[PDB]
Design a protein around this ligand. Structure first.
Ligand SMILES: C[C@@]1(c2cc(-c3cncnc3)c(F)cc2F)CCSC(N)=N1
Length: 388
């Protein structure tokens, strides 16, 4: 019901990530750690870097254990290399428990750390199947549940400000909540609707229908989940498979056609700006994603506003309100990233192999429209939407 100790324990923003304070080692070393449901390694800066103000010093921890094994983790953009070990870990604004967890001590990296993000490591909250070097490296959350009485569930409320924050404002500001071991009813309005976790590797789900202002995108539903659809707090954008991206953008352009925007805007590259307070939210469509429900032949929908998919950014000069388009293409399936998660309180119910969605008590909206979670809808042949 109520988890006051964990409410408001996140800071950050969609563009650079949301992070939680953790301590590692004995005596405790404090570090800020990116909350990432799209990966499964707990990995921390452990050597000086131009963008790190502090790092894990294994030689100062009496409880550090060396696993004598290296790990190399390349991504499409960026990479890091490190040394595997274990140590005692706590989350100060979390459950009052201390656990021994695997930690990859990052000793070298390229384009991984972000200048001014304020985080020094990543907490991969997904499953062992996608851990590096292999699935025998138990992820943090699995350790936490095995070693303590914490229920096998966590929930995330990511709070977008609706306007830009500089590095000073992000430091002073509450970015949201990670509730470990429960669901806090103050963080949402309306009902929670649950979709099954298709397979425990990423948090994989199945999308069964997409609408732009109520108009069906009318693609074969397999296209929406090609080659998977995941919920990922460590990706900024809503990312869509190439063909779905092309269809969706064509439809969003048609809905907003009273104003013409440059190709670079739709490509996610360039900002657009309006005079202060005059952003024409009403010309942009709402986007609905229908998700497989828990009951046979039942779906539900989550609906976001342009206040979610237009990401506020600071002007290159002004008092203008400026934004980038935060929907982009993917060659690795749909990614429901931070700009989608900012609409919703998201419950990662690992114990019951399901993900819940409710309207966020902190989502950005206007006097005419709000984000929504609605159901049920009768939907047939939903398993056929999943890609094999
Ligand atoms: C681990 C990874 C990831 C995320 C962010 C990151 C997080 N939030 C915002 N911007 C960047 C980052 F800065 C570095 C990363 F390696 C791989 C790319 S996708 C993902 N889910 N996690």
């Amino acid at each position: 019901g109520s988890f006051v100790e964990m409410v408001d324990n996140l800071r950050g923003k969609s563009g650079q990530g949301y992070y939680v304070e953790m301590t590692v080692g004995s005596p405790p070393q404090t570090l800020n750690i990116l909350v990432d449901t799209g990966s499964s390694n707990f990995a921390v800066g452990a050597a000086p870097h131009p963008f790190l103000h502090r790092y894990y010093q294994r030689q100062l921890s009496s409880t550090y254990r060396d696993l004598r094994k290296g790990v190399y983790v390349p991504y499409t953009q960026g990479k890091w290399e490190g040394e595997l070990g274990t140590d005692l870990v706590s989350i100060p604004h979390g459950p009052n428990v201390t656990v021994r967890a695997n930690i990859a001590a990052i000793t070298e990296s390229d384009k991984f750390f972000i200048n001014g993000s304020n985080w020094e490591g990543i907490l991969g909250l997904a499953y062992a199947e996608i851990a590096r070097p292999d699935d025998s490296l138990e992820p943090f959350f699995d350790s936490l549940v095995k070693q303590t009485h914490v229920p096998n569930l966590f929930s995330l409320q990511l709070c977008g400000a609706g306007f830009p924050l500089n590095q000073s404002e992000v430091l002073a500001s509450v970015g949201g909540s990670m509730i470990i071991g429960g669901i806090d009813h103050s963080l949402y309005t309306g009902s929670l609707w649950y979709t099954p976790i298709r397979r425990e590797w990423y948090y994989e789900v199945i999308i069964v229908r997409v609408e732009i202002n109520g108009q069906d995108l009318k693609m074969d539903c397999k296209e929406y989940n090609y080659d998977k659809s995941i919920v990922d707090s460590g990706t900024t954008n809503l990312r869509l498979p190439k063909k779905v991206f092309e269809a969706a953008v064509k439809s969003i352009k048609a809905a907003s056609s009273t104003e013409k925007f440059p190709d670079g805007f739709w490509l996610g590259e360039q900002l657009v700006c309006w005079q202060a307070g005059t952003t024409p939210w009403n010309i942009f469509p709402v986007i609905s994603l229908y998700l497989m429900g828990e009951v046979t032949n039942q779906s539900f929908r989550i609906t976001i506003l342009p206040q979610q998919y237009l990401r506020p950014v600071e002007d290159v000069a002004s008092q203008d309100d400026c934004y980038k388009f935060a929907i982009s293409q993917s060659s690795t399936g749909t990614v429901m990233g931070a700009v989608i998660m900012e609409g919703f309180y998201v419950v990662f119910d690992r114990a019951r192999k399901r993900i819940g969605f409710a309207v966020s008590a902190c989502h950005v909206h206007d006097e005419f429209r709000t984000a929504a979670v609605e159901g049920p809808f009768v939907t047939l042949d939903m398993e056929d939407c999943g890609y094999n």
